[PDB]
Every structure is written in structure tokens, then in C-alpha cells.
């Protein structure tokens, strides 16, 4: 899975897609939660490839977003679409990021696909098929 290595690269990545969701994982490869998440993101990448591209960002090597994206969870996954952060209601109370090892591969595809169809349709907000409380 591709990595972004500085702020400029992250900006380039977001600006590189017209018709796909850019999924970013902020964290650390050596981190346990990020390993679980990275496993899932890896195995579903082929499937989401017409509507989604995934990148990893280490938030020590690339600290630029730590304060504003509030990256205080070990593993954060966030969604972008034509340069707009897209939100998902996960029934968690936090609509800006998925911040846990979301173990179910098919569920991740569903969420990523929902975000894509929503963001294309113009919503800045969609809800995950499953409630996660």
C-alpha cells in the first residue's frame, strides 16, 4: 500500500482524483491497530479500485495534520472527495473519522461505496449501513 511522505504529497494525492474517493490512514505501520486496519484496507483495495484509492500516512514523519484533524487516536481513517473532507455518521458520535480497527472487510467496502455515491451525489454527509454503538 502506497505511502505519502510529506504534506505536499498528501496535497497532491487528494488533488489527484476526480472520480474516486481518497481514503487516508493516519497512524503508524508498527502500530497494532494500524496493522489490523492496514490488513483490511489491503485486502479490499482491488475491489474498491474503480471508486476509491487508499494511501498511508505516518503522523510522525508527516505531522502537518495532527492538530487540525485531531489525530490523537492510534489509527485514523478519513475520506476525501474532490478535495472536500467527507463525513460519515457511524452512530459513534464522531462523524469525521473511523478511529478503530474496523475488522469486517465487506462492511468497509459498503462504507467506502456509500461515501463515494453520497459524495458524488453531492452530500457532505452519509451514514454507515451498520450502527457502531
Amino acid at each position: 500500500l502506497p505511502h505519502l511522505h510529506n504534506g505536499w504529497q498528501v496535497d497532491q494525492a487528494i488533488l489527484s482524483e476526480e472520480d474516486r474517493v481518497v481514503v487516508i490512514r493516519f497512524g503508524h505501520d508498527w502500530d497494532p491497530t494500524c496493522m489490523k486496519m492496514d490488513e483490511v484496507l489491503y485486502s479490499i483495495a482491488e475491489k474498491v479500485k474503480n471508486f476509491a484509492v487508499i494511501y498511508l500516512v505516518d503522523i510522525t514523519e508527516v505531522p502537518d495534520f495532527n492538530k487540525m484533524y485531531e489525530l490523537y487516536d492510534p489509527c485514523t481513517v478519513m475520506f476525501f472527495f474532490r478535495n472536500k473532507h467527507i463525513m460519515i455518521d457511524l452512530g459513534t458520535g464522531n462523524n469525521n473519522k473511523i478511529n478503530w480497527a474496523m475488522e469486517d472487510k465487506q462492511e468497509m467496502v459498503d462504507i467506502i461505496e456509500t461515501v463515494y455515491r453520497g459524495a458524488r451525489k453531492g452530500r457532505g454527509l452519509v451514514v454507515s449501513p451498520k450502527d457502531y454503538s
Binding site: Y69, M87, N94
Partner: peptide
């Protein structure tokens, strides 16, 4: 509802804001 979570800015805008802060 009242006081709904707002979306974070884009990476470009974040980076620009950091530049502003300096």
C-alpha cells in the same frame, strides 16, 4: 440538531493555515 460536528478543512487549506500561523 444543535452544535453538529463540522467537516475538517482540506489538506491544502490545513497546510496554508499552518503557513499562516508561522
Amino acid at each position: 440538531p444543535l452544535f453538529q460536528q463540522r467537516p475538517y478543512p482540506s489538506p491544502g487549506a490545513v497546510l496554508r493555515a499552518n503557513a499562516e500561523a508561522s
